[PDB]
Structure 1
Amino acid sequence: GDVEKGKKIFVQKCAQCHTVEKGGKHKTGPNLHGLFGRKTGQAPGFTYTDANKNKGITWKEETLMEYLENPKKYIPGTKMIFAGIKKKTEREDLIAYLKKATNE
């Protein structure tokens, strides 16, 4: 495929949760350097779900083609995001803002 086009997709759809750079940080999702030819759930230092840990397949063009079409269908139980707010005080403050902004 077209690398130029792929880079833009990555930046728009994936970079908010993944880095690709050697030595790049884990974010919501794992750093992806060295992905190709590696089994699922094997970035060093990242805590996966059991589902992503145990999928047991090798990442390559064919498996990525299928995964990317629908990640949850290829790895049921995978979790991409936690959209909540665990701290009580942060929940109270956020709700205060929402109470104001969603009514003005």
Structure 2
Amino acid sequence: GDVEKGKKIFVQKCAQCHTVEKGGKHKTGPNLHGLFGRKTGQAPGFSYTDANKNKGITWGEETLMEYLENPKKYIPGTKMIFAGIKKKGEREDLIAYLKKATNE
């Protein structure tokens, strides 16, 4: 995916609920720093739904590709209000940006 295109998508559709940098505050949604390689619902200090905390998968390119296409379908009961991103390419770009931004 194209990191720059993904940055635009993140800013437009995610930033209002999520920060990606280390130490970034939790907002409506949890801070995403360290996302890749971590299990669902493990960011300290954020009140996740039990649905999220119990999904039990590890965040990575593949799990994110599915989750972002339709959040509610992948994690029934999630309190994340987001319809999903239909275009495969757009999800690829966004995930490429997340891979970088949540690890710097």
Q: TM-score, normalised by structure 1?
A: 0.77
Pairwise CA distance, 1:76 = 0.1
Task: Show the counterpart of 1:67.
Answer: 67
Tell me how far 1:81 sits from its aligned partner.
Answer: 5.1
Provide structure 2 residue ranges, at least 5 long, that are not aligned to the other structure.
none
> Using the alignment, how far apart are the partners of 1:93 and 1:63 within structure 2?
15
Runs of at least 4 residues off by over 4 Å: 81-104
**What are the superposed Cα offsets for residues 15-59 of structure 1, whole Å, 9 maximum, x if unpaired?**
000000110000000000000000000001111000001000000
Distance 2:95 2:5 in 1: 40
Larger relative contact order (C-alpha < 8 A, sep ≥ 6)?
Answer: 2
Computing the radius of gyration from Cα coordinates, the structure with the larger value is: 1
Structure-2 change in CA distance of 1:8 and 1:96 (3 Å): closer
What is the TM-score when the length of structure 2 is the normalising length?
Answer: 0.77
SS of the residue corresponding to residue 69 of structure 1 reads coil
Unaligned runs of 5+ in 1: none
Give the deviation of 1:80 after TM superposition: 1.9
User: Aligned pairs, how many?
Assistant: 104
CA RMSD for the aligned pairs? 15.1
Name the CA distance, whole Å, in 2 between partners of 1:6 and 1:63: 17
Percent identity between matched residues is: 97
